[model samples]
Target: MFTINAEVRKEQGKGASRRLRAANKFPAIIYGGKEAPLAIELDHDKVMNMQAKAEFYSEVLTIVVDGKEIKVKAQDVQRHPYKPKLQHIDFVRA
Candidate 1:
């Protein structure tokens, strides 16, 4: 099973997201199902490494947060058109 660590984000906005990246974290969102959408930040290097795998996008990921594991699948990913970097990611519960 693929797993990654993440922290819930209480803040939202372009500036907050930029701050997250500046701290070596990637912005992500989790939506769908019964619960409300969740905003989170994950380790950039870990996610970047996962992005290199062919199944990373297609397979479900286990996001561990505060000792809880949430299962999600990649719904979308935004990347820099020219640079080899990820801007944001969207995930939905599986």
Candidate 2:
């Protein structure tokens, strides 16, 4: 299941991450099954809530970014341990 709105990114590293995370946003990257890997960002809202579900880790994710709804598979995710927040995630193409 998928329905996460994302914004693409270019700048990388902890410097950018510090700004993003502090602003209540985090990164989620989508690597290709063939095409180039995608670097997208998401808010700490519905997408964060979605990550808590068991199925979110197992199947295809329809990541809606730009004008495309790309199907991806979850490879891994990062979460805050002491608090409730999602840090980052990487998805593979379906």
Candidate 3:
């Protein structure tokens, strides 16, 4: 299976995340699944593109990064409601 790799980031705040969004990326966090909770940021285009192509709600995937893998499923995506912009995302590990 194909996967997108992301690096962990520490910045957390509305302003910081807004910057990320402006840069066409989304902020996320990974928890449980044999590792510590990881604060991560990923390309908004990549994820949104995948969601647009395939329904992320129906399938599970592996979020692999830095040699670690987590079984995750995409859930609620908070967007601008009117704009085709992703504000944030929520995920759960299996």
Candidate 4:
């Protein structure tokens, strides 16, 4: 099992993403079911390490945000065209 700690993000947009990257975190979204979509941020290094695992894409991810743990599956992952960096991620309920 993989556990990723995340922080709730209040801002959403290109500017917010840039700010997140400046802080060494990447933006992500969790959306599904009856709950409204959430904007969050995760540690770049932590996510990168998880991405290296073969099951990162197929397995459920345990995300802790604001002390609440949610099970989610990665629906999409956006990365830089050339740079080895993650741009954003989209997660859905698992």
Candidate 5:
């Protein structure tokens, strides 16, 4: 199974996102489970390492949030035209 590690970010909104990305970490959100969504930061290298492939979108994503492991699937993955990463990524609780 492929796994991605993430850290929760306290700040929200556009400026915070820009700050994270500027620091080499991109913002990602995973919603569902009937609870409030969680905002996270992903490493640029790891996102590139898990680049598009057949299994990339076909299988479940093992994402570690701090110390919690959640079963989520990448539902909508928006690509970044200029950057070697994603503009937005969404993971649905599974």
Candidate 6:
């Protein structure tokens, strides 16, 4: 039942994405159902904080982007090395 909000970013490419990661944000792509894949970045601290609280894979995630809410499941997570960084994430449509 864990949930959080997110937003779609218009920007793409390696450098911009790298900056997001360096700034402690995790880049992600959401897909499945009838929805198209969306490129998004979430607050790294927020995601890590959530992970510490509960089991994410078994929970539902409420994602909000630009005020649009979407239901999802924490399908996958990619972690970083020796730090509280999130390399990547994938959310499946709920």
Who wins the lDDT comparison? Answer: 4
Runs of candidate 2 with Cα error greater than 4 angstroms are none
Order of the predicted models by lDDT, top scorer first: 4, 1, 2, 5, 6, 3
Return the TM-score for candidate 5, rounded to 2 decimals. 0.81
Weakest lDDT window of 10 consecutive positions for candidate 4: 48-57
Q: Where in model 1 is the C-alpha error above 4 Å?
A: none
RMSD over all Cα atoms, model 2: 2.2
After superposing candidate 3 on the true structure, give the runs of residues whose Cα lies further than 4 Å from its correct spot.
Answer: 31-36
lDDT of 5 by residue, 1-94 (tens): 7677887776876776888778887777778868587777877667656647646556777778786777677777888798766777777776
Task: Put down candidate 1 lDDT per residue, 18-60, tens digits, no spaces.
Answer: 7886888888888897858887788877877776675777898
Error of 4 at 13 (Å): 3.2
- lDDT scores for all predictions? 0.79, 0.74, 0.66, 0.80, 0.73, 0.72
- With a 3 Å backbone cut-off (N, CA, C), the pairs that clash in candidate 5 are none
- Lowest lDDT sum, 10 consecutive residues, model 1, at 48-57
TM-score between candidate 6 and the true structure:
0.77
Per-residue lDDT of model 6, residues 7-82, tens digit only: 7875767865877868867677778867477777778778777656546667777777767887777777877777
1-94, model 3: which lDDT tens digit per residue? Answer: 5354555677776765877768877787665557566666777777676555444646765666565676666666677678987767655665
Model 5 scores what on Cα lDDT?
A: 0.73
Model 4 CA lDDT for position 87: 73
Reference-based TM-score of each model: 0.85, 0.79, 0.70, 0.85, 0.81, 0.77
lDDT measured at residue 1 in model 4 versus the true structure, 0 to 100 = 76
